[PDB]
Design an enzyme around this catalytic site. Structure first.
Site, PDB file in Angstrom:
ATOM      1  CG  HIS A 157      -1.780   1.351   1.604  1.00  0.00           C
ATOM      2  ND1 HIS A 157      -2.781   1.599   0.724  1.00  0.00           N
ATOM      3  CD2 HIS A 157      -1.480   2.302   2.610  1.00  0.00           C
ATOM      4  CE1 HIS A 157      -3.278   2.923   1.138  1.00  0.00           C
ATOM      5  NE2 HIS A 157      -2.416   3.230   2.290  1.00  0.00           N
ATOM      6  CG  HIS A 200       0.329   6.676   0.716  1.00  0.00           C
ATOM      7  ND1 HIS A 200      -0.416   7.718   0.996  1.00  0.00           N
ATOM      8  CD2 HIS A 200      -0.377   5.615   1.471  1.00  0.00           C
ATOM      9  CE1 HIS A 200      -1.394   7.429   1.862  1.00  0.00           C
ATOM     10  NE2 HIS A 200      -1.381   6.245   2.214  1.00  0.00           N
ATOM     11  CD  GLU A 214      -5.326   6.067   2.696  1.00  0.00           C
ATOM     12  OE1 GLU A 214      -4.975   6.826   3.811  1.00  0.00           O
ATOM     13  OE2 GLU A 214      -4.327   5.400   2.219  1.00  0.00           O
ATOM     14  CB  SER A 242      -2.824  -0.061  -2.547  1.00  0.00           C
ATOM     15  OG  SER A 242      -3.601   0.690  -1.471  1.00  0.00           O
TER      16      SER A 242
END
Ligand SMILES: C[C@H](O)[C@H](O)[C@H]1CNc2nc(N)[nH]c(=O)c2N1
Ligand SMILES: C[C@H](O)[C@H](O)[C@H]1CNc2nc(N)[nH]c(=O)c2N1
Ligand SMILES: [Fe+2]
Ligand SMILES: [Fe+2]
Lengths: 307, 307
Positions: A168, A173, A213, A232
């Protein structure tokens, strides 16, 4: 006024504030019955606990099984990015492949990714053991510091994680922190958080949810994903650009109070016009937060100036 | 357009561009007939030649005779600063004494001074062998890099130097680079220089002479010295605040074309209202320099952005 770090080194105070009894201890965790996995998780937590600002992030030799899990996640997600990820993501990913070892058979080391991000935007990584408070996690963003996990999900369920893991962090990110306008936008959320009352930290955490997010952004006449949770998630990255969810323009007086859950696909996404526009919106929202001072980061001295 | 560095590392190109046949080779130099002094100067030049961006600056054990020369300069000048130097100088000097070893019996090491300045304003030192072109010297300021000598004047004439030496750098320049507004002002001169035509480099060098080297500034209802050439000259620091010189307001269309010499006290000084005002004046002058682009320094990545 709540305490907040005024130097980048003071982020060291945060690692003696995480939730100590993590998700991997839960009976429903994919790795719960595996005591080798339990030990491996404790090994990565101890690296984070012992880390201090300024140090190189310790390199870890990943096991073959861990590299297999990464590879499954990497190859299945990579198939969607050209068409579903924003330009900024697709621009930087080949350089991550070439210069940071992002490949199906290799888990990148955080020290290498951190140095890469520093050359892009001054962003750096810090290894983190587990869940920080929203206040401490967001405060690191004011310094362009991303608290980053180093462990991987259990290999029994490569497409599933109940928590951030290294797949992730790196695939969701890191690519966006390589973009200047995104770095500035994310940092603005961090600056808004410093010394904010708890009530406003929760509103900033909700803005974060619907941007960093799970955000979508305009791109010319199209819409693309930029949220790390989307990038992700094989299933949700496809869903989010389908006819099924509802889309609304990013509007922080609405977004900041919108409810959500983490256990199903989002029914609703907010669309940013651009990262610079989102940044200006956050700056305007931040002015509404009761704080008896203003703040600015000085990148020359790595200190927060409080007026 | 003339080449200019776009990354802080590219300042390394400059050390293979100094005047190789320096002042210490001249028959009138105080140390000309001393072959031990000649060798000592070559030793410091070789440290500068071999230095590369990013490295610690090599520490040097100074000889007792060198420390005596420093002490003579230090104690005679220190007697004037409380009354003649600007507030910014007097504010930081005791911290230089406490944290960088500025004392009559100790020559500070450049690595320590550089780390100190970095914590103050992001300024750093680079050891330099001898005279740079105005273009290369000013260009380092755009990066908040001060090219700094490490040798000392010959001990036969402690109150006299025909050149920058370590006493001039440390007692004249370093204290002002510890002030944010001064750092910003000096950096603005550096940014104006990047890619400027030679004609304008000479005008910026003249502005530099009348500010960074020989400037006076308003302080409340008084006037104080901030120029490094003044702060390192016992005689001229007293003269400059006497009735003898002429004083005019800093006005860059006049200042930039004003003639001067280096071999007597200045007959004329220009008075800055403040470092922020001087900075805005430089920014306005810089807009008049024919350059087919604008520039900005990004301290997060240590690169110049060219638009
Ligand atoms: C800001 C918002 O609470 C967000 O969910 C935070 C919470 N704490 C976290 N803690 C860690 N280590 N990693 C993160 O991504 C986050 N996310
Ligand atoms: C900018 C103006 O030319 C100024 O006199 C410069 C020239 N080159 C120099 N070179 C070195 N090494 N040190 C300095 O202080 C200067 N000053
Ligand atoms: Fe995340
Ligand atoms: Fe000088």
């Amino acid at each position: 006024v709540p305490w907040f770090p005024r130097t980048i080194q003071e982020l060291d105070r945060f690692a003696n504030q995480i939730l100590s009894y993590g998700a991997e201890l839960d009976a429903d965790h994919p790795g719960f019955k595996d005591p080798v996995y339990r030990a491996r998780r404790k090994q990565f937590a101890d690296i984070a606990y012992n880390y201090r600002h300024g140090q190189p992030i310790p390199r870890v030799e990943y096991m073959e099984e861990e590299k297999k899990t990464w590879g499954t996640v990497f190859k299945t997600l990579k198939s969607l990015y050209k068409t579903h990820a924003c330009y900024e993501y697709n621009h930087i990913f080949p350089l991550l492949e070439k210069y940071c070892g992002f490949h199906e058979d290799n888990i990148p080391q955080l020290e290498d990714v951190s140095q890469f991000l520093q050359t892009c935007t001054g962003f750096r990584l810090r290894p983190v053991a587990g869940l920080l408070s929203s206040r401490d996690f967001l405060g690191g963003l004011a310094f362009r510091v991303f608290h980053c996990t180093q462990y991987i999900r259990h290999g029994s369920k490569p497409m599933y994680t109940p928590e951030p893991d290294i797949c992730h962090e790196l695939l969701g990110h890191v690519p966006l922190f390589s973009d200047r306008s995104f770095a500035q936008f994310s940092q603005e959320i961090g600056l808004a958080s410093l010394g904010a009352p708890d009530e406003y930290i929760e509103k900033l955490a909700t803005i974060y949810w619907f941007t960093v997010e799970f955000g979508l952004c305009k791109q010319g006449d199209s819409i693309k994903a930029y949220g790390a949770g989307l990038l992700s998630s094989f299933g949700e990255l496809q869903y989010c650009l389908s006819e099924k969810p509802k889309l609304l323009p990013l509007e922080l007086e609405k977004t900041a109070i919108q409810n959500y859950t983490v256990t199903e696909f989002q029914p609703l996404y907010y669309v940013a016009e651009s990262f610079n526009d989102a940044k200006e919106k956050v700056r305007n929202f931040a002015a509404t937060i009761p704080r008896p001072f203003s703040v600015r980061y000085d990148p020359y001295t790595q200190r927060i100036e409080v007026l």
